Design a binder for this molecule. Structure first.
Ligand SMILES: Nc1nc2c(ncn2[C@@H]2O[C@H](COP(=O)(O)OP(=O)(O)OP(=O)(O)O)[C@@H](O)[C@H]2O)c(=O)[nH]1
Ligand SMILES: Nc1ncnc2c1ncn2[C@@H]1O[C@H](COP(=O)(O)OP(=O)(O)CP(=O)(O)O)[C@@H](O)[C@H]1O
Ligand SMILES: Nc1nc2c(ncn2[C@@H]2O[C@H](COP(=O)(O)OP(=O)(O)O)[C@@H](O)[C@H]2O)c(=O)[nH]1
Ligand SMILES: CCS(=O)(=O)NCc1ccc2c(c1)OCO2
Ligand SMILES: [Ca+2]
Ligand SMILES: [Ca+2]
Ligand SMILES: [Ca+2]
Ligand SMILES: [Mg+2]
Ligand SMILES: [Mg+2]
Ligand SMILES: [Mg+2]
Lengths: 54, 438, 352, 425
């Protein structure tokens, strides 16, 4: 049971109590992901319009 | 002084942001018009509260915040509510139609079209900062925007602000206050693509907030207002060290150092006390020991789980009110001889304690009663994995039938992203089990 | 209407409890994966406690205390006793035991050998028994070399404990025996002892000059019925109930089962359960637990009771299923989900 | 500002649509002239969802009245609220559809569809952000069934990413006009399977049983049957017409109610259904017990024959929301064998303070249940009984249709029944 790094100021204080010692995707890659899904949407919609035109 | 930019995404993020910035103003003595008589430096200053508010020449203290929602109804309340005067219009971004509770719709379909605008607005706030620490991102797991657009925002933020810390406040889906059936899907999808981008995340289970409002506040059917005022108290307790003079958790960097030794396991459990009804004739003020002992009662946790059957990696006690180190260390000695606090052998068995003498502030007319001292314990427990296991299980039930998957594929998402996200969760659960169980 | 699910088809006990529940016309059984249940008769291993108590509007109850394995595992029990101040290392009702890991994997090998050398030097009876949890595999011997070399042949943790060389032998026969007590702990953590115990007697005469034949030394109901030649001679199924055993103690030892054996049994039951209550209690928890426990005891010729082990998923004596099972329904299930005596249990009061 | 464009086609569609606008106009305080005279701001909060605002604070429904003969629409214009509809939004012919799906879809209807789309485009152009469409029609006739599904097909082509919603009246021999109704209903169902996100199934046979047995109406009429449809249409749209957060958007509703794209046919329900003992107060338990009772359902399918995929209840009026959850959670927990266990929390409740006219409180039920396969089974059997003899086909082959098209509609619906059966297990 020890207290360490006790810091006191006007608005409070803080300290540490120890009981026992121990024993990314680039901007380009994000544009591709976004554009890939946009493309898949464009494909599905064209398949709908192709179906409707038939 | 280093600045902190708050970001609120979706309905949950925006309504919780509203509740917090209301609480911040009451705490710093800021009025609805942005005026702060205590600030003797007009239109400038590098004080502690300046980490969250900038200043104009006219004395207006403007939150360093950005609200984003794909539909405008929730943000219009901000534009006309009590604190309309705090923000200028560029800080409130609203779209025309939301993500329909569809992750794919918010991340891909709509997110692709609005992402560059949001970053531009955030870039404006960054340009007012002399030393930006990082960001605080509030959002829900279940919403289409909260899950979908947030994970996109975190990806870009890591690209545009590589050396900046990002902390999350995430609302874990609870059926008692939701009508969306696909929320397990959204939650797991957003956790997967956000994991490598978030440095520390405080999950709040709506089921926990709900039951605390029924048990401790006598709210038979709590509303979002009831939930958000309680959630903003825990948020204030967590962010207080950034906004006031102190020495513990003085910058976003310190949250990871003190709470996250292993990067993927960055979901600390939060426990708050006391929550006392205001309608009570008059309550007996709880002692440092009693409220500290309450930090180990599952009933006061932001996520219902049993820490008795996990292992601790860190623990911080953030006190506010009439508290002195003499009383704190005393109650801790008594709680070790009674409680089941098992630490991991490669972490020091101890507690970091922060005390702020200003007791908790309560919104006038709110549900919470003024108390002389309160505490918030941030502990990193393997027990919180119970929440992933639950959420992951509901995912497995629907995905076994491919139920609702077509709505996501229809927005341009590949089905393999489901399984890729689920396999990531399976490994996250395994990380907790390898660190906690024997 | 109350609903329940069954996730352990092998449990003879709760198989009867489920039959009793359905007999009241007030309990409905759902598929074992339906989350909307009031009562879970759960699985033995890896029961997912984390998913209990999250269904809105449902008070959910389970028949296992999460964490009670610390008491029902061989090595865990020894560690619990040596480490728990409530039980201490000097506890006078638990045989001297040590946790010994096979060398192919802390361990108490040295500590065990110093105590072994201490006995061998002081002319004292130095007979130990090595056992584990992965058994049907048990060994008895007076040489430490045979005990250690046996555990290394295996691959799981074992425990070495002092063998009771002076057991109490029933006459006629001169035969060993153990005592099984059934204990039920409810959601409020009341400790109820079933008034009906069972002595699983060895139908073979005890023999201290030959531990090679483990038929008169092990009183297991499965060994006496597979490797014993006098099975069912003195008592049907090598099972003597309290009514009989009590009369024997009177005619032979001029004492009663309550005074000479039961007072100690009740004391041990209280000590173990109270010790772990803070760790496993579901008082302030989002779900509720109850559980049936099987305590095994040994009695020496001095009428001092010793604790053998604790079973988390015990079976019941055939003649006592209806009474005990119905009792579980009464105080464990209906006490939380009531329906529209002379109790069979003995409540062991204690300070919570 | 999430506007919905309303289309009503054919006799049934225009008469049910008529009473609908009459019922909701009352709830929003709009009189027959379009002038608002309510006393609660909740009436105007979401008023633009179904109404346009003209000069002088006039509220004009966003509805298009379509038919191939003038009869029914002359009545609407002369009916109670006939004055409230935009005169331009009346689009009709003189030929009629002769209860013939082919005439509505391929011949007569084709000559008229372009002018209808010109009106649909005019209403959409003035929409701030268009949610989607909703169509009222029957499937047993010619205009609503044949031309109605044609309009849907052409609306989806021009507005592919907008929700398409319908209130569809299913034919029944108990309330039948002609024997070819199975032909017309089977041809439409396939169109709806492909081109609608949500179809509220309204079985005239169920409406009959409710009027005869529960409501004790000796000799029910189409007017009486339409009182229930009006009341049900008001309930299912309460989420859209008043301030709410649960199922408040057409796309959000579709997302939580449709686990699979083809299984989007809902069973609606309403409570109370009282016979004139009509002033007694209805308790929350009674609202729930009745709302979930088959006798209160309009699809004419016994739910206990299948399983609910998703459920959406809406309670209207001032009541205990705590006691609402207590009774809803009591129905699920007392009949969990009829709710699929592989969709966690598939029953959602929504409360509304404003009750329907003349009622202290009510409840509307919306179920996506596999039991609906019984309704499609009935239609299929009546179709095959005639089609195996090619009876009455000349009415259709004389309009350019071929037998192969009928054989395909047959296989299509029988596939739909099979798809329901595999999820009921
Ligand atoms: N605690 C809390 N939770 C909220 C609040 N608002 C919504 N939620 C939760 O958020 C989940 C739904 O996600 P939302 O945030 O409403 O949806 P969204 O982020 O706006 O995304 P969209 O689908 O486009 O509307 C549900 O589980 C709600 O319980 C709130 O104000 N407070
Ligand atoms: N230290 C000891 N001294 C004397 N006898 C002992 C003993 N340890 C075990 N025994 C004998 O072994 C038997 C119990 O074995 P144990 O209970 O450890 O194995 P087990 O757990 O597989 C049987 P169960 O769990 O069903 O009671 C008893 O009959 C007892 O006589
Ligand atoms: N519920 C209801 N059903 C109707 C009404 N009018 C017609 N029907 C049913 O609709 C079918 C006839 O279609 P109808 O609308 O008259 O043909 P259309 O005018 O060419 O579209 C039959 O099944 C009738 O029972 C009505 O006012 N209410
Ligand atoms: C025994 C009562 S009833 O059969 O007359 N009422 C139902 C009904 C109403 C209108 C109908 C119809 C049937 O067939 C054509 O139009
Ligand atoms: Ca200043
Ligand atoms: Ca980073
Ligand atoms: Ca012509
Ligand atoms: Mg939203
Ligand atoms: Mg055993
Ligand atoms: Mg007609």
């Amino acid at each position: 049971m020890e207290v360490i790094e006790l810091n006191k100021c006007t608005s409070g204080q803080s300290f540490e109590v120890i009981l026992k010692p121990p024993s990314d995707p680039s901007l380009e890659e994000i544009q591709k992901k976004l554009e890939a899904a946009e493309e898949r949407r464009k494909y599905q919609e064209a398949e709908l319009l192709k179906h409707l035109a038939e | 002084m280093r600045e902190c930019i708050s970001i609120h995404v979706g309905q949950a993020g925006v309504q919780i942001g509203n509740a917090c910035w209301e609480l911040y103003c009451l705490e710093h003595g800021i009025q609805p018009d942005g005026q702060m008589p205590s600030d003797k430096t007009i239109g400038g200053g590098d004080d502690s509260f300046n980490t969250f508010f900038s200043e104009t020449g006219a004395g207006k203290h403007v939150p360093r915040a950005v609200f984003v929602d794909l539909e405008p109804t929730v943000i219009d309340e901000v534009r006309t509510g009590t604190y309309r005067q705090l923000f200028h219009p560029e800080q409130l971004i609203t779209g025309k139609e939301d993500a329909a509770n569809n992750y794919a719709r918010g991340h891909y379909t709509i997110g692709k079209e609005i992402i560059d605008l949001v970053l531009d607005r955030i870039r404006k706030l960054a340009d007012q900062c002399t030393g930006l620490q990082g960001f605080l991102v509030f959002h829900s797991f279940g919403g289409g925007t909260g899950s979908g657009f947030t994970s996109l925002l975190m990806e870009r933020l890591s690209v545009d602000y590589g050396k900046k810390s990002k902390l999350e406040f995430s609302i874990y889906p609870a059926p008692q206050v939701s009508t969306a059936v696909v929320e397990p899907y959204n939650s797991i999808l957003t956790t997967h693509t956000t994991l490598e981008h978030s440095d520390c995340a405080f999950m709040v289970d709506n089921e926990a907030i709900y039951d605390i409002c029924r048990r401790n506040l006598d709210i038979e059917r709590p509303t979002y207002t009831n939930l958000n005022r309680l959630i903003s108290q825990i948020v204030s307790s967590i962010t207080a060290s950034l906004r006031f003079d102190g020495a513990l958790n003085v910058d976003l960097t310190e949250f990871q150092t003190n709470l996250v030794p292993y990067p993927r396991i960055h979901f600390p459990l939060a426990t708050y006390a006391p929550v006392i009804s205001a309608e009570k004739a008059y309550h007996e003020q709880l002692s440092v020991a009693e409220i500290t002992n309450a930090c180990f009662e599952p009933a006061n946790q932001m996520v219902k789980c049993d820490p008795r059957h996990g292992k601790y990696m860190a623990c911080c006690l953030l006190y506010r009110g009439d508290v002195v180190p003499k009383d704190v260390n005393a109650a801790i000695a008594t709680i070790k001889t009674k409680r089941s606090i098992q630490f991991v052998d490669w972490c020091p068995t101890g507690f970091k304690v922060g005390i702020n003498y200003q007791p908790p502030t309560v919104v006038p007319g709110g549900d919470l009663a003024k108390v002389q001292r309160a505490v918030c314990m941030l502990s990193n427990t393997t027990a919180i994995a119970e929440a992933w296991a639950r959420l992951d299980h509901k995912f497995d039930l629907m995905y076994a039938k491919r139920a609702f998957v077509h709505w996501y594929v229809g927005e341009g998402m590949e089905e393999g992203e489901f399984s890729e996200a689920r396999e990531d969760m399976a490994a996250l659960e395994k990380d907790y089990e390898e660190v906690g169980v024997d | 209407m109350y609903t329940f699910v069954v996730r352990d088809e092998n449990s003879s006990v709760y198989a009867e409890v489920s039959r009793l529940l359905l007999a009241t016309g007030q309990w409905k059984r759902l598929r074992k994966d339906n989350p909307r249940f009031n009562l879970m008769l759960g699985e033995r291993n890896r029961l997912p406690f984390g998913r209990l108590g999250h269904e809105p509007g449902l008070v959910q109850l389970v028949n296992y205390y999460r964490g009670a394995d610390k008491l029902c595992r061989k090595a865990s029990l020894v560690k619990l006793i040596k480490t728990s101040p409530e039980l201490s290392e000097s506890c006078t009702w638990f045989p001297e035991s040590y946790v010994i890991y096979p060398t192919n994997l802390t361990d108490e090998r040295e500590v065990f050998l110093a105590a072994y050398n201490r006995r061998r030097e002081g002319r004292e009876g130095n007979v130990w028994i090595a056992k584990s949890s992965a058994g049907a595999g048990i060994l008895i011997s007076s040489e430490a070399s045979e005990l250690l070399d046996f555990i290394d042949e295996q691959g799981q943790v074992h425990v070495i404990q002092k063998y009771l060389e002076k057991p109490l032998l029933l006459e006629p026969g001169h035969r060993k025996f153990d005592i099984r007590s059934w204990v039920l702990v409810d959601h409020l953590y009341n400790i109820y002892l079933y008034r009906e115990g069972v002595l699983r007697t060895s139908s073979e005469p005890y023999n201290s000059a030959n531990f090679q034949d483990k038929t008169c030394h092990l009183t297991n109901h499965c060994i006496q019925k597979e490797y014993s030649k006098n099975y069912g001679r003195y008592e049907e199924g090598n099972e003597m109930f309290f009514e009989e055993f009590n009369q024997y103690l009177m005619d032979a030892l001029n004492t009663t089962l309550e005074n000479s054996i039961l007072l100690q049994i009740k004391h041990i039951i209280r000590s173990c359960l109270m010790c772990i209550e803070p760790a496993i209690s579901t008082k302030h928890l989002h779900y509720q637990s109850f559980q049936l426990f099987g305590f095994d005891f040994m009695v020496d010729e001095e009428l001092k009771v010793w604790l053998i082990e604790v079973n988390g998923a015990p079976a019941c004596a055939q003649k006592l299923y209806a009474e005990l099972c119905q009792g579980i329904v009464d105080v464990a299930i209906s006490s939380v989900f009531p329906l529209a005596p002379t109790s069979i249990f003995i409540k062991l009061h204690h300070h919570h | 500002m999430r506007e919905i464009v309303h289309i009503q086609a054919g006799q049934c569609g225009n008469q049910i649509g008529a009473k609908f606008w009459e019922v909701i106009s009352d709830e929003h305080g709009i009189d027959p002239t379009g002038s608002y005279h309510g006393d609660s701001d909740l009436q105007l909060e979401r008023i633009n969802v179904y109404y346009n605002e003209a000069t002088g604070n006039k509220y004009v429904p966003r509805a298009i009245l379509v038919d191939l003969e003038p009869g029914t629409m002359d009545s609407v214009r002369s009916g109670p609220f006939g004055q409230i509809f935009r005169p331009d939004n009346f689009v009709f012919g003189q030929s009629g559809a002769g209860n013939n799906w082919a005439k509505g879809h391929y011949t007569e209807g084709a000559e008229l569809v372009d002018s209808v789309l010109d009106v649909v485009r005019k209403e959409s152009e003035s929409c701030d952000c268009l949610q989607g469409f909703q169509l009222t029609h029957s499937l047993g006739g010619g205009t609503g069934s044949g031309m109605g599904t044609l309009l849907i097909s052409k609306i989806r082509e021009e507005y592919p990413d907008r929700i398409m919603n319908t209130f569809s009246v299913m034919p029944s021999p108990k309330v039948s006009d002609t024997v070819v109704e199975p032909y017309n209903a089977t041809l439409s169902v396939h169109q709806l399977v492909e081109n609608t996100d949500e179809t509220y199934c309204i079985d005239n046979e169920a409406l009959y049983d409710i009027c005869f047995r529960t409501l004790k109406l000796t000799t029910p009429t189409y007017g009486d049957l339409n009182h229930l449809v009006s009341a049900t249409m008001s309930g299912v749209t309460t989420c859209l017409r008043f301030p709410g957060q649960l199922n408040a958007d057409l796309r959000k509703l579709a997302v939580n109610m449709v686990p699979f794209p083809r299984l989007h046919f809902f069973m609606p329900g309403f409570a109370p259904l009282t016979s004139r003992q009509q002033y007694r107060a209805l308790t929350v338990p009674e609202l729930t017990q009745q709302m979930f009772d088959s006798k209160n359902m309009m699809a004419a399918c016994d739910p206990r024959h299948g399983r609910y995929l998703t459920v959406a209840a809406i309670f209207r009026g001032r009541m205990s929301m705590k006691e609402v959850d207590e009774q809803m959670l009591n129905v699920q927990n007392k009949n969990s064998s009829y709710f699929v266990e592989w969709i966690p929390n598939n029953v959602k409740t929504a409360v509304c303070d404003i009750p329907p006219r003349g009622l202290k409180m009510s409840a509307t039920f919306i179920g996506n249940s596999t039991a609906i396969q019984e309704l499609f089974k009935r239609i299929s059997e009546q179709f095959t009984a005639m089609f195996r003899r090619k009876a009455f086909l000349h009415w259709y082959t004389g309009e350019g249709m071929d037998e192969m098209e009928f054989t395909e509609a047959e296989s299509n619906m029988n596939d739909l029944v099979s798809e329901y059966q595999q999820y009921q297990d």
